[PDB]
Design an enzyme around this catalytic site. Structure first.
Site, mmCIF file in Angstrom:
data_model
loop_
_atom_site.group_PDB
_atom_site.id
_atom_site.type_symbol
_atom_site.label_atom_id
_atom_site.label_comp_id
_atom_site.label_asym_id
_atom_site.label_seq_id
_atom_site.Cartn_x
_atom_site.Cartn_y
_atom_site.Cartn_z
ATOM 1 N N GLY A 87 -7.910 84.402 10.317
ATOM 2 C CA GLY A 87 -9.290 85.018 10.332
ATOM 3 C C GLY A 87 -9.893 83.051 10.489
ATOM 4 N N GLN A 88 -11.548 83.204 9.633
ATOM 5 C CA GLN A 88 -11.656 81.580 9.490
ATOM 6 C C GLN A 88 -11.131 81.164 8.973
ATOM 7 O OE1 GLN A 88 -16.524 81.972 9.735
ATOM 8 N NE2 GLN A 88 -16.155 80.016 7.033
ATOM 9 N N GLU A 146 14.887 78.384 -4.431
ATOM 10 C CA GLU A 146 15.441 78.111 -5.183
ATOM 11 C C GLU A 146 13.668 78.102 -6.609
ATOM 12 O OE1 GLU A 146 19.136 75.272 -5.360
ATOM 13 O OE2 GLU A 146 17.462 75.228 -7.539
ATOM 14 N N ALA A 190 -14.761 91.807 13.176
ATOM 15 C CA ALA A 190 -14.495 92.921 12.442
ATOM 16 C C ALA A 190 -15.801 93.157 11.408
ATOM 17 C CB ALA A 190 -12.690 92.132 11.341
ATOM 18 N N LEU A 239 12.118 75.236 -2.193
ATOM 19 C CA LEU A 239 11.225 76.041 -2.979
ATOM 20 C C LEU A 239 11.596 77.332 -2.788
ATOM 21 C CD1 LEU A 239 8.365 77.149 -3.830
ATOM 22 C CD2 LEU A 239 7.893 77.465 -0.835
ATOM 23 N N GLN A 296 -9.980 77.438 8.597
ATOM 24 C CA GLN A 296 -9.821 76.255 8.880
ATOM 25 C C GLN A 296 -9.374 75.570 7.483
ATOM 26 O OE1 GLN A 296 -15.153 76.895 9.608
ATOM 27 N NE2 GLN A 296 -13.969 77.028 7.791
ATOM 28 N N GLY A 309 -9.311 88.308 7.640
ATOM 29 C CA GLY A 309 -8.321 88.164 6.905
ATOM 30 C C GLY A 309 -7.399 89.499 5.976
HETATM 31 N N1 LIG Z 1 -11.883 77.898 0.394
HETATM 32 C C1 LIG Z 1 -11.860 78.671 2.020
HETATM 33 N N2 LIG Z 1 -12.489 80.129 1.980
HETATM 34 C C2 LIG Z 1 -13.266 80.545 2.990
HETATM 35 C C3 LIG Z 1 -12.689 79.716 4.256
HETATM 36 N N3 LIG Z 1 -14.034 80.482 5.238
HETATM 37 C C4 LIG Z 1 -14.086 81.925 4.923
HETATM 38 N N4 LIG Z 1 -13.657 81.871 3.318
HETATM 39 C C5 LIG Z 1 -14.266 83.351 2.230
HETATM 40 O O1 LIG Z 1 -13.312 83.783 3.127
HETATM 41 C C6 LIG Z 1 -14.115 85.195 2.853
HETATM 42 C C7 LIG Z 1 -14.837 86.294 3.771
HETATM 43 O O2 LIG Z 1 -13.483 86.163 4.705
HETATM 44 P P1 LIG Z 1 -13.823 85.473 6.688
HETATM 45 O O3 LIG Z 1 -12.394 84.959 6.837
HETATM 46 O O4 LIG Z 1 -14.207 84.340 6.051
HETATM 47 O O5 LIG Z 1 -14.015 86.513 7.537
HETATM 48 P P2 LIG Z 1 -12.076 87.133 8.126
HETATM 49 O O6 LIG Z 1 -10.926 86.558 8.256
HETATM 50 O O7 LIG Z 1 -13.015 85.463 9.886
HETATM 51 O O8 LIG Z 1 -12.791 88.031 8.482
HETATM 52 P P3 LIG Z 1 -14.136 88.336 9.747
HETATM 53 O O9 LIG Z 1 -15.807 89.811 8.520
HETATM 54 O O10 LIG Z 1 -13.913 90.027 10.595
HETATM 55 O O11 LIG Z 1 -15.030 87.199 10.552
HETATM 56 C C8 LIG Z 1 -14.929 84.711 1.600
HETATM 57 O O12 LIG Z 1 -15.328 85.405 0.515
HETATM 58 C C9 LIG Z 1 -15.201 82.857 2.140
HETATM 59 O O13 LIG Z 1 -15.493 82.399 0.546
HETATM 60 C C10 LIG Z 1 -13.065 78.400 3.824
HETATM 61 O O14 LIG Z 1 -12.448 77.734 5.523
HETATM 62 N N5 LIG Z 1 -12.358 78.119 2.581
HETATM 63 MG MG LIG Z 2 -14.606 85.744 10.731
#
Ligand SMILES: Nc1nc2c(ncn2[C@@H]2O[C@H](COP(=O)(O)OP(=O)(O)OP(=O)(O)O)[C@@H](O)[C@H]2O)c(=O)[nH]1
Ligand SMILES: [Mg+2]
Ligand SMILES: Nc1nc2c(ncn2[C@@H]2O[C@H](COP(=O)(O)OP(=O)(O)O)[C@@H](O)[C@H]2O)c(=O)[nH]1
Ligand SMILES: O=C1NC(=O)[C@@H](c2cn3c4c(cccc24)CCC3)[C@@H]1c1c[nH]c2ccccc12
Ligand SMILES: [Ca+2]
EC number: 3.6.5.-
Lengths: 421, 440, 67
Positions: free
Chosen positions: B10-11, B254, B99, B252, B15, B146
């Protein structure tokens, strides 16, 4: 990419439809010839959402123009950005609805609907991944109302896994003298509540009151009402059209805005008609709603808001937190964090900064109660009912449409009265 | 050997992966093209950094990682980014449709269409390992991918790799950077489904990281980039023992022995120090005692909770940089006689210590000051259950009215799965309560 | 002692396989159940759209039978 297929039916639908395309074509920096002459790459990042890319870098709107009368079709083609629309996507009858819902839904429109679907089908088949459809129309007329709701049902048959969104213009005696409108509205609502995922309730009553009392425009024209609509439609689609902190599509919006399937009728808002605290208070003010409803007569289920322009984002976050605290009673507590703020760096045309509001409020019942009141006043006398039964309809279909819209109201009332404990 | 395969879902996962791997490269002196001049064994090797990087005959050091997302635009930035040469195109997997903030779509509707492909690409990495140790999975709780797809993947990995260790870096949702109103639903569903398939999970509260960026780095409104660069430092601290060697280096695994007293009690609380700006760190040396004492300041925790109102079941200190055992012991002795540190009665009170002499690293144009020594505390506290309690409450408010549930049911899920998931969380909250009760 | 040693490692294998086995089956059961439900939901959606077509036929039919 993630494409949206635009559709505009009837007179009203094509008017606001054309305006919508005029405004966003300017924001994305393309001229009526379809060529790009912008300065920022952010204009073309998510351009494919609404535009097809043709030979020689020509951006053609993914739009389908519909009407049971060929009059308005010439207006668009002659109007500005008339040379940008795809010629084959023009689908026109010869009859004319004559403000008869039954004609648009069962008779005249049912004969033209297939040729529209052929155009829908051609646009859709070329999409990388279609996310859904957005329809602009009025509920007071016959074509955009009657045939518009027929198209929705027909499109939903071939694309049941796509999002159906509508920009529905609600009728008001303050704007249209036509007497039969509360019939076309109720019959349309009977369809929208069943077969759409999201509906933006553009209310002429609200549009009139804004132009008249706030903008100080006595005897306002449709051009004045549409200047509000266009600015609204531009706002609520910003998150769909531009890249930001979070990118949105029709589905993700529906998931976050609609807690229960039937309750998907949003009251949009816009501000102004400055500094950050000013904008925020206005957009939550009843005077700035495009639906003739007082939000403080009900509770917010969900709320979405964009702030457009270069400004302090720390300030926006603090003020939106401020409003929710001072107006906590008007947000349901059994949905935590039901208010989200979005930010777009690129401002609209003319304004250094603005704010658009999307509210799923239980106060929307006021709008439906108004229509229901005007409806039952006509239906108790069976006035002009022969225009509908003449097309083969039954009295029951009026009764069912009435009671279904009655349920929608009471269901909005149920969750207004609900508590955490 | 002892290779570790990272999976970024996921995003959030992707990232964060970008930040982590960029940071790894700088720590090991690996260039954006994958070349590592200091590495004299070309095409292979059994060095410590090889746990995370494979090697091609052309001298390129390739991350043992897979990036997965159901939407292409996030990973597309990796494909065209600064470190695009680092990854083989097959390591970067994308669909055409996300999703939509829906667990059901991530686990079923959309996820099932790509799950076989992902496993095949993971298998190709595993077949390059001479002694695969386990997997590290990066993902958010709130996203549809995610949440939904991760749980599906974790289930499938348990089938394909048996009891091979699977660790988690899970992003716990926060309102300040929320993306959906149904994130509590996705959170509870994932935690329930993944619980039996995870051996250890490091939760990262976004609000905690948001606060730290605002408070300690004076970032008025932190972006994902701000959050991720801080997170990657915590991740780096935890994986440092796997990626480097040293006399006082403690593996890790341990720490993991001490951190997990029961299978379900596998959620360590991470605390990192020092987080400080360049302006404040200038002419300002934070000693071993100072950064160690900072580990017991709740403001520095990765998860918002109060250990001072809970009980400890383990306490691990992972130092890196200029640190010697003598100063650690002195700092700990001072802390024990001044802090609210209380252990359960069935566990020993000694702090487990690890030291990696490799000094901390920062990414160019970052906010974090470069310091000579840093520390990441990993503690098993009953107080982490507070994070479950807050999530479960937000879940209850909406589910009592079945708000937004139809979006899940429409994708084939049943209300029984919601209640089953919530009951598991209720039992988990009870578990953390029980382990804190004194013995009979 | 040798006999006990065999039984311990055999038990470890058994439990490991049982965990894999149950996990494989529990998942197959879920994806199947989810497939049924999602289909039945879409099938029901099409059925009442089918009812809207049948109704429209009865409307157009009713018109010409009143002339
Ligand atoms: N720390 C951090 N949190 C993130 C980042 N990107 C998204 N999030 C968190 O992830 C949550 C949403 O999940 P996402 O990862 O963005 O969505 P996804 O996993 O791509 O799933 P989809 O709904 O299908 O897009 C939110 O609460 C965001 O705050 C990031 O780059 N860094
Ligand atoms: Mg996404
Ligand atoms: N805001 C707005 N409303 C309109 C416009 N034209 C018509 N309407 C509304 O739409 C209703 C009439 O429907 P109409 O579009 O003419 O029916 P159709 O063309 O046959 O589908 C009336 O209640 C009007 O208030 C317009 O240009 N702007
Ligand atoms: O970009 C976005 N996508 C979404 O799903 C929107 C959203 C609505 N709610 C959200 C919640 C959480 C997170 C995201 C969103 C709480 C309830 C309502 C969000 C948005 C914020 N302001 C807008 C203005 C116009 C169009 C979309 C938006
Ligand atoms: Ca080597």
């Amino acid at each position: 990419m993630r494409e949206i297929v635009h559709i505009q039916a009837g007179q009203c639908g094509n008017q606001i439809g054309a305006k919508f395309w005029e405004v966003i074509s300017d924001e994305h920096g393309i001229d009526p010839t379809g060529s790009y002459h912008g300065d920022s790459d952010l204009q073309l990042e998510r351009i494919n959402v609404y535009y097809n890319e043709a030979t020689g870098n020509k951006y053609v709107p993914r739009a389908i123009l519909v009407d049971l009368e060929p009059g308005t079709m010439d207006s668009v083609r002659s109007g500005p950005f008339g040379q940008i629309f795809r010629p084959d996507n023009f689908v026109f009858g010869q009859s004319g609805a004559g403000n008869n819902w039954a004609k648009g839904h069962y008779t005249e429109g049912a004969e033209l609907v297939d040729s529209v679907l052929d155009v829908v089908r051609k646009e859709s088949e070329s999409c990388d991944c279609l996310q859904g459809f957005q329809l602009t129309h009025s509920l007071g007329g016959g074509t955009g109302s009657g045939m518009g709701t027929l198209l929705i049902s027909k499109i939903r048959e071939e694309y049941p896994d796509r999002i159906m969104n509508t920009f529905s213009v609600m009728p008001s005696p303050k704007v249209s003298d036509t007497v039969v409108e509360p019939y076309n509205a109720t019959l349309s609502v009977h369809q929208l509540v069943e077969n759409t995922d999201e509906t933006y309730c553009i209310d002429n009553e609200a549009l009139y009151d804004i132009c008249f009392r706030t903008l100080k425009l006595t005897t306002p024209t449709y051009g004045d009402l549409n200047h509000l609509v266009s600015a609204t439609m531009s706002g609520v689609t910003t998150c769909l059209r531009f890249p930001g902190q979070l990118n949105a599509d029709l589905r993700k919006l529906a998931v976050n805005m609609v807690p229960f399937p039937r309750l998907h009728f949003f009251m949009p808002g816009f501000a102004p008609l400055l500094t950050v605290p000013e904008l925020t208070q206005q957009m939550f003010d009843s005077k700035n709603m495009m639906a003739a409803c007082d939000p403080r007569h009900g509770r917010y289920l969900t709320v979405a808001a964009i702030f457009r322009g270069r400004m302090s984002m720390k300030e926006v976050d603090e003020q939106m937190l401020n409003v929710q605290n001072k107006n906590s009673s008007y947000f349901v507590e059994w949905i935590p964090n039901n208010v989200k703020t979005a930010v777009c760096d690129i401002p609209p045309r003319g304004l250094k900064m603005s704010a658009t509001f999307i509210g799923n409020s239980t106060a929307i019942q006021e709008l439906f109660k108004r229509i229901s009141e005007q409806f039952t006043a006509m239906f108790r006398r069976k006035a002009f009912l022969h225009w509908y039964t003449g097309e083969g309809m039954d009295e029951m279909e009026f009764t069912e449409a009435e009671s279904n819209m009655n349920d929608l109201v009471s269901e909005y009332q149920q969750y207004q009265d609900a508590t955490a404990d | 050997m002892r290779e570790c395969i990272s999976i970024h879902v996921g995003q959030a996962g992707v990232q964060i992966g970008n930040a982590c791997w960029e940071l790894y490269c700088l720590e090991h002196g690996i260039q954006p093209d994958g070349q590592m001049p200091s590495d004299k064994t070309i095409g292979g090797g059994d060095d410590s950094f090889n746990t995370f990087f494979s090697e091609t005959g052309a001298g390129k050091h390739v991350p043992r990682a897979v990036f997965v997302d159901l939407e292409p635009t996030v990973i597309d930035e990796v494909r065209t980014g600064t470190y695009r040469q680092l990854f083989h195109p097959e390591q970067l997997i994308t669909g055409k449709e996300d999703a939509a903030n829906n667990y059901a779509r991530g686990h079923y509707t959309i996820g099932k269409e790509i799950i076989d492909l992902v496993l095949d690409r993971i298998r190709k990495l595993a077949d390059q390992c001479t002694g695969l140790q386990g997997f590290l999975v990066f993902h958010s709780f709130g996203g549809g991918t995610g949440s939904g797809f991760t749980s599906l993947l974790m289930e499938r990995l348990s089938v394909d790799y048996g009891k091979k260790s699977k660790l988690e870096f899970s992003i716990y949702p926060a309102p300040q950077v929320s993306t959906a109103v149904v994130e509590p639903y996705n959170s509870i569903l994932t935690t329930h489904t993944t619980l039996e398939h995870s051996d250890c999970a490091f939760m990262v509260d976004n609000e905690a990281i948001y606060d730290i960026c605002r408070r300690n780095l004076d970032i008025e409104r932190p972006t994902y980039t701000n959050l991720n660069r801080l997170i990657s430092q915590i991740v780096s601290s935890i994986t440092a023992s796997l990626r480097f060697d040293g006399a006082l280096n403690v593996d890790l695994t341990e720490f993991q022995t001490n951190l997990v007293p029961y299978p379900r009690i596998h959620f360590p609380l991470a605390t990192y120090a020092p987080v400080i700006s360049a302006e404040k760190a200038y002419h300002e040396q934070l000693s071993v005692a100072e950064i160690t004492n900072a580990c017991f300041e709740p403001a520095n925790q990765m998860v918002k909770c109060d250990p001072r109102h809970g009980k400890y079941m383990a306490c691990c200190l992972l130092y890196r940089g200029d640190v010697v055992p003598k100063d650690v012991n002195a700092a700990i002795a001072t802390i024990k006689t001044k802090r609210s540190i209380q252990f359960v009665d069935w566990c020993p009170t000694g702090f487990k210590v690890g030291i990696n002499y490799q000094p901390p690293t920062v990414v160019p144009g970052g906010d974090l000051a470069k310091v000579q020594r840093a520390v990441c505390m990993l503690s098993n506290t009953t107080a982490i259950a507070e994070a479950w309690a807050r999530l479960d409450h937000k879940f209850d408010l909406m589910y009592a009215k079945r708000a937004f549930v139809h979006w899940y049911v429409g994708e084939g899920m049943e209300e029984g799965e919601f209640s089953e998931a919530r009951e598991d969380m209720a039992a988990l909250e009870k578990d953390y309560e029980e382990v804190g009760v004194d013995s009979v | 002692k040798r006999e006990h040693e065999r039984e311990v490692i055999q038990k470890a294998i058994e439990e490991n396989n049982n965990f894999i086995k149950m996990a494989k089956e529990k998942l197959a059961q879920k994806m199947e159940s989810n497939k049924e439900n999602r289909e039945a939901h879409l099938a029901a959606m099409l059925e009442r759209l089918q009812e809207k077509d049948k109704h429209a036929e009865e409307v157009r039919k009713n018109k010409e039978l009143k002339e």
